[PDB]
Amino acid sequence: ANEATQELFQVLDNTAIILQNELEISYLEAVYETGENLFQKEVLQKEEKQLKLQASYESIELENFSNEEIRKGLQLALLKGMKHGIQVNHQMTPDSIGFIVAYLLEKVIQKKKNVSILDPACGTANLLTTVINQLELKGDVDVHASGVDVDDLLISLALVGADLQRQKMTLLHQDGLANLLVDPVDVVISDLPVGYYPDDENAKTFELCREEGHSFAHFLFIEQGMRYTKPGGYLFFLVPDAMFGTSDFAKVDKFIKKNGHIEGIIKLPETLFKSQARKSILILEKADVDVKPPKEVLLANLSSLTDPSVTAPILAEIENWFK
Ligand SMILES: C[S@@+](CC[C@H](N)C(=O)[O-])C[C@H]1O[C@@H](n2cnc3c(N)ncnc32)[C@H](O)[C@@H]1O
Numbered sequence: 416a417n418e419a420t421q422e423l424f425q426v427l428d429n430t431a432i433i434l435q436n437e438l439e440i441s442y443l444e445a446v447y448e449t450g451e452n453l454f455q456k457e458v459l460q461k462e463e464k465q466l467k468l469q470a471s472y473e474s475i476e477l478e479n480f481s482n483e484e485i486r487k488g489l490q491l492a493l494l495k496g497m498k499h500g501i502q503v504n505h506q507m508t509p510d511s512i513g514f515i516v517a518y519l520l521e522k523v524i525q526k527k528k529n530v531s532i533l534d535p536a537c538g539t540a541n542l543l544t545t546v547i548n549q550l551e552l553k554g555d556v557d558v559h560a561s562g563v564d565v566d567d568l569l570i571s572l573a574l575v576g577a578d579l580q581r582q583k584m585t586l587l588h589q590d591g592l593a594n595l596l597v598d599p600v601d602v603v604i605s606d607l608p609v610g611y612y613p614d615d616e617n618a619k620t621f622e623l624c625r626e627e628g629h630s631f632a633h634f635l636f637i638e639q640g641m642r643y644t645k646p647g648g649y650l651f652f653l654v655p656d657a658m659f660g661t662s663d664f665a666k667v668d669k670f671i672k673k674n675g676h677i678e679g680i681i682k683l684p685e686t687l688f689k690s691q692a693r694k695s696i697l698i699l700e701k702a703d704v705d706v707k708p709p710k711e712v713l714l715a716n717l718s719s720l721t722d723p724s725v726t727a728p729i730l731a732e733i734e735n736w737f738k
C-alpha cells in the first residue's frame with residue numbers, strides 16, 4: 416500500500432481528531448478509542464458527530480487491507496500521537512528498526528516452521544507485529560508471539576492493533592518482571608525501558624538486583640528475558656549504546672556469561688532516533704549442550720541505513736554469521 420495505508424490513516428486521523436475534541440482526551444487515547452470503534456463496527460461512546468464518525472468508518476472495509484497496511488496505518492497515527500510529551504521509555508519502535516530486527520531473526524531461525532517470540536516490555540506491539548508480519552510473509556513460518564506491558568494505554572493500543580491487524584497473539588497487561596505465564600520462547604525481542612524499576616521487593620528475586628536503592632529496569636529485563644528463553648534460543652534487545660561503557664555493565668556481562676553469550680552488538684544509525692541517544696541491537700544466545708560462543712563477537716557500526724558503502728560489508732557479514 417501506502418495507497419491503502421494512507422486511506423486507513425486518514426480514517427483514523429479524522430475520527431481521532433473528533434474523539435480528541437468531543438471527549439477531551441489525548442490524540443493517542445483517541446487513537447485507541449477510534450480503533451475499537453472501527454474494529455467492532457460501532458461508535459462505542461454514543462452517550463458522550465456520531466453520524467460523521469460512522470460515515471468515516473464505513474468508507475473503508477478493513478478485510479481488503481493487508482496486515483502490514485493496517486499496521487503501517489496505525490504506525491502513522493501512533494507516531495503523530497507520540498510527537499510531544501511522550502517519554503523515551505514510552506516511544507514506539509518504528510519499522511526502520513523493526514525490519515532490522517525481523518531480518519536478524521530470519522538469520523537465527525533458519526528452517527524452523529514454528530517460532531515462538533516474547534516481548535516482555537512490548538508497548539504498542541509495533542515491533543512485535545512488524546516482526547510477526549515479516550517472518551510469516553513467505554507462508555512457511557508460524558509465529559507464536561507474546562507481549563507484556565505494564566502500561567494501560569499502551570497495552571490497550573497493542574490489543575486493538577492486534578484486533579485490527581487480525582493477529583492471533585497473546586498480550587498481557589502486567590509487570591513483565593513479575594512471574595509470566597509464558598512458556599520459554601525461541602526468541603526474545605524488546606526495546607528496553609531504561610531507568611529505575613520501582614518494585615524493590617520483586618527486584619530481590621533477580622541476581623541483577625541492586626543492594627541499595629532501586630534496581631535498573633534495563634538490567635532486570637535482560638535477566639528476565641534470558642529466564643524465559645529456551646536453551647539455545649536468542650535474544651535481541653534495543654538498548655542505548657552508552658550502556659556498554661558503564662562500570663555497572665561488567666555485572667550484566669558476567670551474568671550473561673554464566674547463562675549464555677553475546678553474539679553481537681550492532682550500532683544503529685543516528686538519524687533513526689529523535690534527539691533519544693543512539694541505540695544498538697544487543698544479540699545474545701542462551702546456553703545449551705551444543706551451543707558455543709562465536710570466536711569473536713560481531714561489532715558493527717551501522718552508521719547509515721541507506722548508504723551501501725556502509726551497509727554492504729556489515730550485511731554481507733551478517734548474511735553468513737549465524738550459518
Ligand atoms: C521503548 S517502549 C517499547 C516500544 C515498543 N517496542 C513498541 O513497538 O511500541 C518500552 C516499554 O517498557 C514498558 N515497561 C516499563 N516497565 C515495565 C514493566 N515493569 N513491565 C512491562 N513493561 C514495562 C513501558 O510501558 C514501555 O512501553
Ligand SMILES: [Cl-]
Nearest residue numbers: 481482580581
Ligand atoms: Cl490475514
